[PDB]
């Protein structure tokens, strides 16, 4: 019965896990949280009544580059201008590089454009629920991609004397793009569990 | 040259033949029968059923009635023969008891005739040949009657006072259909053969001859008009073109065409192959091809 409650516990194996991966800092405590250890930190009347303040922040270790990300659920279904533009000031108050907002189900067009517009350098990404609540990263068929600093980016275009176009592209709408949060132009090195003979390295950009 | 058989349809079926499922329809009843009297054989039938769009409506059946024009629910045609009153119409299709299941499917069928509703309108909803004509009723009615005596199930009888005979067949046709959607039997098998017929050098040289004589009566008919005007005298072997079928068979049998060198372009390839006298054995196996 209380199925829709337990079903979100997995949104923290799809979230705090979503970090490094990237490069931010999360506690190895928040990664080994069992079924009940989750209900522990969160005090809900029942039983049921959960919600509350589901959504925290985190810091990175890459020192510079800036800045920081903010994980924030809802938990209000269907969203939603009455929860979007109103939950950005918060994002501008503690100052963050960017953050996440999840939902279920569907999101209105209106509350999708009137945002990423004055955002400037920052960014709104991206996911939702009843979708990516299980880390696909952990899949026989999914090789681990790792990001490339802009310095390393210039490497390829020399060693292989190429153009930022002549490389293997990746659609934005790719759960692994969204996952690492690729923006149009960055370049991602992936180490394929190929044969091959060997451990062959492929590279890709965004589009 | 050796004429060679052919295997098209059969006629006079009595043939389920369904399909699916692009899909548009669902359950057909092709008939394409037609005299048969000694040449002619142009005409068809077919009737639909539909059973999609869970929103529209309740699985309703229709008809086509060549060669024009669209879809025409069934009750509309019974009401166009001599059986307008309900109940009696179902008697031709099913037989209670009954067995409402097979009948029920009628509900949606009848609803299509909830406006007929007698004999006037019936014949009315038939104005669509065509190439733009009519004006309007009276004329339309006349065309409807003509159709019922040549198009609507052209075999049986083409007389005048025989519309009560074609009233059951339709019931018989659609009797078959119901047996399949309800899943009471199985769609006839087009594999036959057992049901298809081989058109030897006979029925073949029929449809041609006819397709060359009807021009006779046309080429000469025009001559009379020119004679009666300015001319006259009467007639005589003055016309009757000699080179009409004499030359008009040479290059129609010689090649795979059926009316050359006229416009008749895509007219099914012969059927006319040269003999093939390599080995005696062969010669024979040729006079037996289709």
């Amino acid at each position: 019965e209380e199925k829709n409650i337990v079903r979100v516990f997995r949104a923290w194996k799809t979230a705090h896990q979503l970090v490094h991966d990237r490069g931010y800092g999360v506690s190895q405590a928040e990664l080994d949280l069992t079924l009940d250890q989750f209900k522990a930190m969160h005090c809900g009347m029942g039983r049921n009544l959960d919600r509350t303040t589901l959504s925290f922040y985190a810091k990175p270790s890459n020192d510079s580059n800036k800045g920081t990300i903010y994980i924030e659920f809802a938990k209000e279904p269907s969203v939603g201008i009455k929860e979007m533009r109103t939950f950005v000031h918060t994002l501008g108050d503690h100052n963050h590089k960017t953050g996440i907002l999840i939902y279920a189900n569907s999101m209105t067009p209106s509350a999708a454009k009137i945002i990423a517009t004055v955002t400037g350098q920052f960014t709104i990404e991206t996911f939702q629920e009843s979708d990516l609540i299980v880390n696909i990263t952990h899949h026989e068929l999914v090789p681990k991609h790792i990001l490339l600093s802009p310095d390393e980016k210039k490497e390829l275009l020399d060693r292989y004397k190429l153009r930022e176009t002549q490389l293997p592209r990746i659609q934005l709408a790719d759960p692994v793009a969204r996952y690492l949060g690729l923006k149009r132009g960055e370049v991602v090195k992936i180490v394929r569990r190929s044969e091959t003979s060997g451990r062959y390295n492929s590279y890709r950009i965004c589009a | 040259k050796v004429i060679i058989a052919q295997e098209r349809s059969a006629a006079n079926i009595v043939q389920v033949f369904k399909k699916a499922a692009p899909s548009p329809i669902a359950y057909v009843a092709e008939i394409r029968s037609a005299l048969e009297r000694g040449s002619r054989l142009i005409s068809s039938m077919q009737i639909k059923l539909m059973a999609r769009n869970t929103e529209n409506s309740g699985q309703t059946i229709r008809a086509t009635l060549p060669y024009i024009r669209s879809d025409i629910p069934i009750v509309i045609v019974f009401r166009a023969l001599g059986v307008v009153p309900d109940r009696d119409i179902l008697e031709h299709i099913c037989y209670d008891p009954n067995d409402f299941q097979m009948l029920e499917m009628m509900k949606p069928c009848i609803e299509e005739a909830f406006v007929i509703q007698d004999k006037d309108i019936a014949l009315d909803y038939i104005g669509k040949r065509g190439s733009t004509t009519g004006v309007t009723r009276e004329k339309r009615l006349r065309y409807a009657h003509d159709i019922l005596q040549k198009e609507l199930l052209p075999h049986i009888t083409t007389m005048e006072g025989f519309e009560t005979r074609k009233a059951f067949f339709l019931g018989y046709m659609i009797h078959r259909m119901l047996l399949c959607a309800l899943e009471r039997r199985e769609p006839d098998d087009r594999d036959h053969f057992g049901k298809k017929r081989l058109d030897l050098a006979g029925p073949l040289l029929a449809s041609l001859f006819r397709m060359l004589f009807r021009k006779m009566t046309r080429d000469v008919y025009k001559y009379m008009q020119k004679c009666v005007e300015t001319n006259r005298e009467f007639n005589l072997t003055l016309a009757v073109k000699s080179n009409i079928i004499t030359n008009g068979l040479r290059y129609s049998l010689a090649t795979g065409n059926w009316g050359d060198q006229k416009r008749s372009m895509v007219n099914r390839v012969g059927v006319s192959q040269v003999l093939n006298r390599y080995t005696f054995a062969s010669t024979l196996s040729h006079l037996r091809r289709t």
């Binding site: 293997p168 003979s197 451990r199 062959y200 390295n201 | -």
Partner: protein, 206 residues
């Protein structure tokens, strides 16, 4: 009979249709002098020559002895020590040393550090299979080779454990296919032959 008699009438045409499809989309590709396969427009599709880097046509499926082996017997094939062992000295002939001073004792556990980082990975990459197609049949260059020179157990090795290990390191680093250095460009090469490599430390380990 008349079924496989029309099913043979198809493969006669269709088979041809599907053929042209591929061609009409792959003519584009070819291997550029850089050691990479690229599109008409230059858009690159592979960074090797086929991930391997080698010509399909010169290759022989081969076998990794060092894989489907019990750790218990693994040690009984490669590992060596002075712990109540020293059985090789019976072969060191002619010339033992004996044992000289350190160094040797140390080379022996360093070889296995890497022959061992290879036993664990794979697996961690390959399911369970062992037979895979590599370039240059090694299992054969050694026989025939024990035909050319022969010498049976009766003749012990005029070699030296400090040679066979140098032997490789000098002749794996001669197997280059991506040139050159050009630092970091030596990486694509170090592991564009990494598989072929674990063979040469498994059939030529001390």
């Amino acid at each position: 009979g008349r079924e496989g008699l029309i099913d043979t009438a198809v493969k006669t045409a269709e088979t041809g249709y599907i053929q042209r499809r591929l061609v009409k989309a792959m003519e584009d590709v070819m291997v550029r002098y850089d050691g990479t396969v690229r599109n008409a427009m230059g858009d690159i599709i592979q960074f090797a020559y086929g991930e391997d880097g080698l010509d399909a046509t010169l290759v022989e499926y081969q076998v990794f002895d060092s894989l489907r082996l019990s750790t218990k017997q693994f040690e009984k094939k490669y590992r060596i020590d002075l712990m109540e062992d020293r059985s090789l000295s019976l072969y060191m002939e002619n010339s033992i040393e004996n044992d000289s001073s350190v160094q040797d004792l140390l080379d022996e556990e360093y070889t296995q550090l890497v022959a061992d980082r290879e036993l664990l990975c794979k697996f961690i990459f390959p399911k369970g299979d062992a037979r895979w197609p590599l370039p240059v049949n090694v299992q054969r260059i050694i026989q025939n080779a024990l035909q050319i020179f022969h010498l049976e157990a009766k003749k012990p090795t005029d070699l030296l454990p400090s040679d066979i290990i140098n032997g490789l390191n000098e002749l794996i680093a001669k197997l280059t296919i991506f040139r050159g250095s050009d630092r970091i460009t030596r990486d694509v090469q170090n592991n564009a032959t990494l598989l072929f490599q674990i063979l040469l430390r498994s059939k030529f380990a001390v």
